[PDB]
Amino acid sequence: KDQQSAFYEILNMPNLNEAQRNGFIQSLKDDPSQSTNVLGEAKKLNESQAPK
């Protein structure tokens, strides 16, 4: 379920571009055991790329 919820959130993060969203989604497919950490880094990039 941590895979599943993370996929959805990453999909709808407003401040990632397509290449980033697609790469994080692939990482979730690649290694589901890292789902929480992958979501954490997607969140970090979503925050740092917030529009100014």
């Binding site: 980033q20 790469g23 690649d30 890292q34 880094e41 990039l45 790329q49």
Partner: protein
């Protein structure tokens, strides 16, 4: 065992890359007790551990500095290992090497791996 790594290139900070490592030589069974990993050699630095995966179980282990950003995986049918690299930063600039051991590594150092790819070069620009 023979290893050929590829996929490195130039990428802008924040971007993604996917490295591949084709395993060759003798034939692999899906449950061979092999371990594959990735090491990287930054400018002015020695080769440093990035990630490893046990071939049989697909159990993974990551260096702290790449957790959440990089994922290692392996496809037995294609006999290939992959490194997905996301949220890239200038300090990820390095030559990346596929590596393998016919067993369980006793350390995270180069000495624990006896088979090596030739390296693929990753450059992360600002």
């Amino acid at each position: 065992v023979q290893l050929q790594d590829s996929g490195g290139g130039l990428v802008q900070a924040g971007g993604s890359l996917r490295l591949s490592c084709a395993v060759s030589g003798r034939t692999f069974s899906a449950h061979s007790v092999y371990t594959m990993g990735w090491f990287r050699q930054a400018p002015g630095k020695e080769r440093e551990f990035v990630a490893r995966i046990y071939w049989s179980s697909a159990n993974t282990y990551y260096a702290d500095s790449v957790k959440g950003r990089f994922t290692i995986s392996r496809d037995n049918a294609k006999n290939t290992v992959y490194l997905q690299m996301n949220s890239l930063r200038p300090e990820d600039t390095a030559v990346y090497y596929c590596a393998a051991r016919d067993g369980i590594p006793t350390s995270r150092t180069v000495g624990s791996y006896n088979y090596w790819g030739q390296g693929t070069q990753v450059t992360v620009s600002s």
